[PDB]
Amino acid sequence: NMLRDLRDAFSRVKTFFQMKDQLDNLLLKESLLEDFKGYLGCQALSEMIQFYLEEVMPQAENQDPDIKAHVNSLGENLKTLRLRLRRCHRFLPCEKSKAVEQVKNAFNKLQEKGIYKAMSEFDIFINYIEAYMTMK
Protein backbone atom coordinates (compact mmCIF):
# COMPACT_ATOMS: atom_id res chain seq x y z
CA ASN A 1 0.00 0.00 0.00
CA MET A 2 1.00 3.65 -0.48
CA LEU A 3 -0.55 4.19 2.92
CA ARG A 4 2.60 2.96 4.64
CA ASP A 5 4.30 6.21 3.64
CA LEU A 6 1.41 8.19 5.08
CA ARG A 7 1.42 6.07 8.22
CA ASP A 8 5.19 6.50 8.58
CA ALA A 9 4.90 10.28 8.28
CA PHE A 10 2.09 10.33 10.85
CA SER A 11 4.06 8.23 13.35
CA ARG A 12 6.43 11.21 13.41
CA VAL A 13 3.76 13.64 14.71
CA LYS A 14 1.59 11.27 16.71
CA THR A 15 3.29 11.91 20.03
CA PHE A 16 3.14 15.69 19.72
CA PHE A 17 -0.63 15.89 19.14
CA GLN A 18 -1.69 13.03 21.40
CA MET A 19 -3.59 14.38 24.43
CA LYS A 20 -4.24 12.90 27.90
CA ASP A 21 -7.21 11.94 30.12
CA GLN A 22 -9.86 13.43 27.88
CA LEU A 23 -13.12 11.48 27.93
CA ASP A 24 -12.03 10.30 24.46
CA ASN A 25 -14.72 12.18 22.52
CA LEU A 26 -14.11 10.89 19.01
CA LEU A 27 -14.13 13.55 16.26
CA LEU A 28 -13.98 11.14 13.29
CA LYS A 29 -17.06 9.06 14.10
CA GLU A 30 -18.61 5.88 12.68
CA SER A 31 -21.05 8.04 10.68
CA LEU A 32 -18.09 9.44 8.72
CA LEU A 33 -16.83 5.99 7.87
CA GLU A 34 -20.43 5.13 6.98
CA ASP A 35 -20.44 8.10 4.62
CA PHE A 36 -17.11 7.04 3.11
CA LYS A 37 -18.63 3.66 2.30
CA GLY A 38 -21.90 5.02 0.92
CA TYR A 39 -23.29 6.50 -2.29
CA LEU A 40 -21.54 9.84 -1.81
CA GLY A 41 -18.36 8.18 -0.44
CA CYS A 42 -16.08 9.65 -3.08
CA GLN A 43 -17.25 13.17 -2.27
CA ALA A 44 -16.99 12.73 1.51
CA LEU A 45 -13.40 11.47 1.13
CA SER A 46 -12.32 14.17 -1.28
CA GLU A 47 -13.84 16.74 1.10
CA MET A 48 -12.05 15.29 4.12
CA ILE A 49 -8.71 15.30 2.32
CA GLN A 50 -9.34 18.92 1.32
CA PHE A 51 -10.30 19.81 4.90
CA TYR A 52 -7.11 18.26 6.30
CA LEU A 53 -4.90 19.85 3.67
CA GLU A 54 -6.41 23.33 3.73
CA GLU A 55 -7.85 23.87 7.21
CA VAL A 56 -6.25 21.40 9.64
CA MET A 57 -2.63 20.96 8.69
CA PRO A 58 -1.67 24.58 8.08
CA GLN A 59 -2.99 25.38 11.56
CA ALA A 60 -1.27 22.29 12.99
CA GLU A 61 2.07 23.50 11.58
CA ASN A 62 1.91 26.70 13.66
CA GLN A 63 1.55 25.00 17.03
CA ASP A 64 5.32 24.53 17.43
CA PRO A 65 8.29 25.34 15.11
CA ASP A 66 9.72 21.90 15.78
CA ILE A 67 6.64 19.99 14.57
CA LYS A 68 6.17 22.13 11.44
CA ALA A 69 8.38 20.26 8.99
CA HIS A 70 6.91 16.92 10.05
CA VAL A 71 3.36 18.20 9.67
CA ASN A 72 4.27 19.60 6.26
CA SER A 73 5.83 16.24 5.36
CA LEU A 74 2.58 14.46 6.26
CA GLY A 75 0.73 16.97 4.11
CA GLU A 76 2.91 16.29 1.08
CA ASN A 77 2.34 12.57 1.52
CA LEU A 78 -1.41 13.19 1.69
CA LYS A 79 -1.32 15.29 -1.49
CA THR A 80 0.56 12.47 -3.18
CA LEU A 81 -1.88 9.77 -2.06
CA ARG A 82 -4.54 12.08 -3.46
CA LEU A 83 -3.00 12.52 -6.92
CA ARG A 84 -2.30 8.79 -6.94
CA LEU A 85 -6.08 8.24 -7.02
CA ARG A 86 -7.27 11.68 -8.14
CA ARG A 87 -5.56 10.92 -11.47
CA CYS A 88 -5.85 7.19 -12.13
CA HIS A 89 -8.42 4.56 -11.15
CA ARG A 90 -12.06 4.34 -10.09
CA PHE A 91 -11.12 5.48 -6.59
CA LEU A 92 -12.27 9.06 -7.19
CA PRO A 93 -15.08 8.96 -9.82
CA CYS A 94 -16.30 12.28 -8.42
CA GLU A 95 -15.16 15.84 -9.18
CA LYS A 96 -22.84 16.71 -0.01
CA SER A 97 -21.70 15.03 3.21
CA LYS A 98 -23.75 15.51 6.36
CA ALA A 99 -21.07 13.69 8.39
CA VAL A 100 -18.29 15.90 7.03
CA GLU A 101 -20.23 19.05 7.87
CA GLN A 102 -20.70 17.70 11.39
CA VAL A 103 -16.95 17.15 11.63
CA LYS A 104 -16.17 20.70 10.53
CA ASN A 105 -18.65 22.19 12.98
CA ALA A 106 -17.35 20.05 15.87
CA PHE A 107 -13.79 20.97 14.88
CA ASN A 108 -14.65 24.66 14.82
CA LYS A 109 -16.25 24.49 18.26
CA LEU A 110 -13.10 22.80 19.64
CA GLN A 111 -10.96 25.65 18.28
CA GLU A 112 -7.24 25.04 19.02
CA LYS A 113 -7.93 21.87 21.03
CA GLY A 114 -9.67 20.90 17.76
CA ILE A 115 -6.41 21.18 15.78
CA TYR A 116 -4.76 18.73 18.20
CA LYS A 117 -7.74 16.41 18.21
CA ALA A 118 -7.97 16.28 14.40
CA MET A 119 -4.26 15.66 14.04
CA SER A 120 -4.20 12.88 16.67
CA GLU A 121 -7.06 11.08 14.93
CA PHE A 122 -5.27 11.15 11.61
CA ASP A 123 -4.45 7.45 12.07
CA ILE A 124 -8.21 6.84 12.26
CA PHE A 125 -8.46 8.94 9.08
CA ILE A 126 -6.01 6.74 7.17
CA ASN A 127 -7.93 3.71 8.47
CA TYR A 128 -11.17 5.12 7.05
CA ILE A 129 -9.34 5.85 3.80
CA GLU A 130 -8.06 2.28 3.79
CA ALA A 131 -11.57 1.03 4.55
CA TYR A 132 -12.76 3.10 1.57
CA MET A 133 -10.26 1.62 -0.88
CA THR A 134 -10.55 -1.92 0.49
CA MET A 135 -14.06 -1.55 -0.90
CA LYS A 136 -13.19 -1.13 -4.59
Epitope: E54, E55, P58, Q59, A60, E61, N62, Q63, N108, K109, L110, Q111, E112, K113, G114, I115
Partner: antibody, heavy 119, light 107 residues
Protein backbone atom coordinates in the same frame (compact mmCIF):
# COMPACT_ATOMS: atom_id res chain seq x y z
CA UNK B 1 4.22 47.30 6.91
CA UNK B 2 1.30 45.02 7.75
CA UNK B 3 -1.89 47.08 7.54
CA UNK B 4 -5.63 46.44 7.75
CA UNK B 5 -7.61 49.35 6.32
CA UNK B 6 -11.28 49.36 7.19
CA UNK B 7 -14.19 51.02 5.37
CA UNK B 8 -15.81 54.16 6.83
CA UNK B 9 -18.16 54.77 9.73
CA UNK B 10 -21.78 53.87 8.90
CA UNK B 11 -25.10 55.30 10.15
CA UNK B 12 -27.71 52.73 9.20
CA UNK B 13 -31.41 52.17 9.81
CA UNK B 14 -32.90 49.44 12.03
CA UNK B 15 -33.80 46.39 9.94
CA UNK B 16 -31.33 47.14 7.17
CA UNK B 17 -28.00 45.44 6.53
CA UNK B 18 -24.52 46.89 6.11
CA UNK B 19 -21.38 45.39 4.63
CA UNK B 20 -18.00 46.30 6.16
CA UNK B 21 -14.65 45.84 4.45
CA UNK B 22 -11.07 45.27 5.53
CA UNK B 23 -8.36 45.86 2.94
CA UNK B 24 -5.08 44.06 3.75
CA UNK B 25 -1.60 45.05 2.61
CA UNK B 26 2.03 44.47 3.62
CA UNK B 27 1.92 40.68 3.62
CA UNK B 28 0.78 37.69 1.56
CA UNK B 29 -3.01 37.83 1.97
CA UNK B 30 -3.70 34.09 1.68
CA UNK B 31 -1.14 33.13 4.37
CA UNK B 32 -3.25 34.50 7.26
CA UNK B 33 -6.84 34.42 8.52
CA UNK B 34 -9.07 37.47 8.89
CA UNK B 35 -11.01 37.66 12.17
CA UNK B 36 -13.74 40.10 13.15
CA UNK B 37 -14.31 41.46 16.65
CA UNK B 38 -17.10 43.52 18.25
CA UNK B 39 -16.66 46.09 21.01
CA UNK B 40 -19.79 47.76 22.31
CA UNK B 41 -19.54 51.10 24.09
CA UNK B 42 -18.75 49.98 27.63
CA UNK B 43 -15.80 48.09 26.16
CA UNK B 44 -16.47 44.32 26.32
CA UNK B 45 -14.69 42.57 23.38
CA UNK B 46 -16.48 39.74 21.56
CA UNK B 47 -15.10 37.49 18.83
CA UNK B 48 -17.41 37.09 15.81
CA UNK B 49 -15.43 34.57 13.78
CA UNK B 50 -12.76 34.04 11.18
CA UNK B 51 -12.44 33.31 7.49
CA UNK B 52 -9.49 31.62 5.77
CA UNK B 53 -8.90 33.73 2.59
CA UNK B 54 -7.31 30.89 0.67
CA UNK B 55 -10.42 28.72 0.79
CA UNK B 56 -13.23 30.84 2.12
CA UNK B 57 -13.67 28.38 5.03
CA UNK B 58 -15.31 30.06 8.07
CA UNK B 59 -15.60 29.54 11.82
CA UNK B 60 -18.41 31.59 13.46
CA UNK B 61 -19.05 32.23 17.14
CA UNK B 62 -22.48 30.59 17.56
CA UNK B 63 -23.74 33.87 19.02
CA UNK B 64 -23.23 35.67 15.68
CA UNK B 65 -24.21 32.99 13.23
CA UNK B 66 -27.56 34.58 12.43
CA UNK B 67 -26.15 38.11 12.44
CA UNK B 68 -22.90 38.10 10.52
CA UNK B 69 -21.65 36.78 7.21
CA UNK B 70 -17.93 36.76 6.43
CA UNK B 71 -16.55 36.71 2.88
CA UNK B 72 -13.23 37.46 1.16
CA UNK B 73 -12.07 38.65 -2.24
CA UNK B 74 -8.69 36.96 -2.72
CA UNK B 75 -8.10 39.01 -5.87
CA UNK B 76 -8.26 42.33 -4.01
CA UNK B 77 -6.92 41.22 -0.61
CA UNK B 78 -10.18 42.34 0.96
CA UNK B 79 -12.28 40.78 3.68
CA UNK B 80 -15.93 41.62 4.29
CA UNK B 81 -18.43 41.22 7.07
CA UNK B 82 -22.10 41.78 6.44
CA UNK B 83 -24.38 42.43 9.38
CA UNK B 84 -28.09 41.87 8.76
CA UNK B 85 -31.44 42.75 10.36
CA UNK B 86 -29.78 45.55 12.32
CA UNK B 87 -31.02 46.55 15.76
CA UNK B 88 -29.63 48.99 18.31
CA UNK B 89 -27.79 46.01 19.87
CA UNK B 90 -25.56 45.91 16.79
CA UNK B 91 -24.35 49.49 17.28
CA UNK B 92 -20.65 49.09 18.08
CA UNK B 93 -17.08 49.38 16.88
CA UNK B 94 -16.19 46.46 14.61
CA UNK B 95 -12.58 45.50 13.93
CA UNK B 96 -10.81 43.07 11.66
CA UNK B 97 -7.62 41.44 12.86
CA UNK B 98 -5.00 39.27 11.25
CA UNK B 99 -4.34 35.81 12.62
CA UNK B 100 -1.57 33.30 11.94
CA UNK B 101 -3.55 30.16 11.07
CA UNK B 102 -3.95 28.12 14.23
CA UNK B 103 -2.82 30.95 16.52
CA UNK B 104 -6.03 32.77 17.40
CA UNK B 105 -4.52 35.82 19.05
CA UNK B 106 -4.14 39.26 17.54
CA UNK B 107 -0.97 41.33 17.05
CA UNK B 108 -2.48 43.39 14.22
CA UNK B 109 -5.82 45.20 14.18
CA UNK B 110 -7.66 47.27 11.60
CA UNK B 111 -8.46 50.82 12.75
CA UNK B 112 -12.06 49.90 13.52
CA UNK B 113 -15.35 50.89 11.92
CA UNK B 114 -18.14 52.45 14.01
CA UNK B 115 -21.66 51.25 13.15
CA UNK B 116 -24.55 53.33 14.49
CA UNK B 117 -28.01 51.81 14.13
CA UNK B 118 -30.68 54.50 14.21
CA UNK B 119 -33.71 55.93 12.39
CA UNK C 1 -18.14 28.57 26.35
CA UNK C 2 -15.08 29.36 28.43
CA UNK C 3 -15.79 32.23 30.83
CA UNK C 4 -12.77 34.31 31.88
CA UNK C 5 -12.91 36.11 35.20
CA UNK C 6 -10.68 39.11 35.85
CA UNK C 7 -11.03 41.85 38.46
CA UNK C 8 -12.98 44.90 37.22
CA UNK C 9 -10.55 47.44 38.65
CA UNK C 10 -7.17 47.81 40.36
CA UNK C 11 -5.21 50.77 41.69
CA UNK C 12 -1.42 50.85 42.13
CA UNK C 13 1.35 53.49 42.32
CA UNK C 14 4.15 54.11 39.77
CA UNK C 15 7.21 52.03 40.54
CA UNK C 16 5.31 49.20 42.23
CA UNK C 17 4.57 45.65 41.07
CA UNK C 18 1.11 45.01 39.67
CA UNK C 19 -0.45 41.60 39.01
CA UNK C 20 -3.79 40.93 37.30
CA UNK C 21 -5.40 37.55 37.63
CA UNK C 22 -7.56 35.88 35.02
CA UNK C 23 -9.34 32.65 35.78
CA UNK C 24 -10.99 30.43 33.15
CA UNK C 25 -14.09 28.30 33.84
CA UNK C 26 -12.30 25.34 32.21
CA UNK C 27 -8.73 24.59 31.21
CA UNK C 28 -7.28 26.46 28.22
CA UNK C 29 -3.89 24.76 28.70
CA UNK C 30 -1.34 27.48 27.76
CA UNK C 31 -3.59 29.45 25.42
CA UNK C 32 -4.24 32.61 27.43
CA UNK C 33 -3.31 35.95 25.94
CA UNK C 34 -3.32 39.57 27.21
CA UNK C 35 -4.08 42.93 25.61
CA UNK C 36 -3.67 46.52 26.71
CA UNK C 37 -6.23 49.02 25.40
CA UNK C 38 -5.58 52.67 26.06
CA UNK C 39 -8.37 55.23 25.62
CA UNK C 40 -9.03 56.07 22.01
CA UNK C 41 -6.90 53.15 20.83
CA UNK C 42 -7.39 49.63 19.46
CA UNK C 43 -6.19 46.78 21.76
CA UNK C 44 -2.45 45.92 21.71
CA UNK C 45 -1.18 42.37 22.32
CA UNK C 46 1.16 42.19 25.32
CA UNK C 47 1.56 38.54 26.17
CA UNK C 48 0.70 35.42 24.14
CA UNK C 49 0.46 31.77 25.19
CA UNK C 50 0.55 32.72 28.90
CA UNK C 51 4.16 33.90 29.14
CA UNK C 52 5.60 35.07 25.82
CA UNK C 53 6.31 38.73 25.34
CA UNK C 54 4.91 40.18 22.13
CA UNK C 55 7.53 41.94 19.99
CA UNK C 56 7.77 45.66 20.67
CA UNK C 57 6.40 45.26 24.20
CA UNK C 58 8.61 46.37 27.09
CA UNK C 59 10.19 43.75 29.36
CA UNK C 60 8.40 45.27 32.38
CA UNK C 61 5.45 43.15 31.17
CA UNK C 62 5.40 39.39 31.86
CA UNK C 63 2.82 36.64 32.29
CA UNK C 64 2.57 33.19 33.88
CA UNK C 65 0.15 30.33 34.43
CA UNK C 66 -1.44 27.36 32.66
CA UNK C 67 -4.74 25.48 32.88
CA UNK C 68 -7.25 27.82 34.57
CA UNK C 69 -5.13 30.30 36.50
CA UNK C 70 -3.09 33.04 34.88
CA UNK C 71 -1.46 36.31 35.85
CA UNK C 72 -0.24 39.36 33.97
CA UNK C 73 2.53 41.20 35.78
CA UNK C 74 3.73 44.75 35.20
CA UNK C 75 6.90 45.45 37.20
CA UNK C 76 7.51 48.26 37.69
CA UNK C 77 4.23 49.84 36.62
CA UNK C 78 4.32 53.51 35.46
CA UNK C 79 1.83 56.38 34.89
CA UNK C 80 1.16 55.75 31.20
CA UNK C 81 0.15 52.15 31.89
CA UNK C 82 -3.30 53.43 32.86
CA UNK C 83 -5.62 51.49 30.57
CA UNK C 84 -7.92 48.50 30.45
CA UNK C 85 -6.25 45.07 30.30
CA UNK C 86 -8.01 42.07 28.77
CA UNK C 87 -7.27 38.36 28.98
CA UNK C 88 -8.41 36.14 26.05
CA UNK C 89 -8.34 32.38 25.47
CA UNK C 90 -8.01 30.44 22.20
CA UNK C 91 -8.04 26.78 23.34
CA UNK C 92 -11.84 26.41 23.19
CA UNK C 93 -14.46 27.80 20.80
CA UNK C 94 -15.61 30.46 20.59
CA UNK C 95 -12.58 32.59 21.40
CA UNK C 96 -13.59 34.57 24.48
CA UNK C 97 -12.30 37.57 26.43
CA UNK C 98 -12.39 38.53 30.08
CA UNK C 99 -14.49 41.61 30.93
CA UNK C 100 -11.39 43.79 31.27
CA UNK C 101 -9.48 45.15 34.22
CA UNK C 102 -9.27 48.95 34.39
CA UNK C 103 -5.89 50.02 35.80
CA UNK C 104 -5.72 53.19 37.87
CA UNK C 105 -2.42 54.83 38.80
CA UNK C 106 -2.34 56.27 42.28
CA UNK C 107 -0.75 59.68 42.83
Amino acid sequence: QVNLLQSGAALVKPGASVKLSCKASGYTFTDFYIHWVKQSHGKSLEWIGYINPNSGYTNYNEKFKNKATLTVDKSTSTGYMELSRLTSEDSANYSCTRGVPGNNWFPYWGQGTLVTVSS
Amino acid sequence: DTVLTQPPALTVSPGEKLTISCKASESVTSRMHWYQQKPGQQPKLLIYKASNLASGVPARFSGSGSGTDFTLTIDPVEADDTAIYFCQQSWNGPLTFGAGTKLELKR
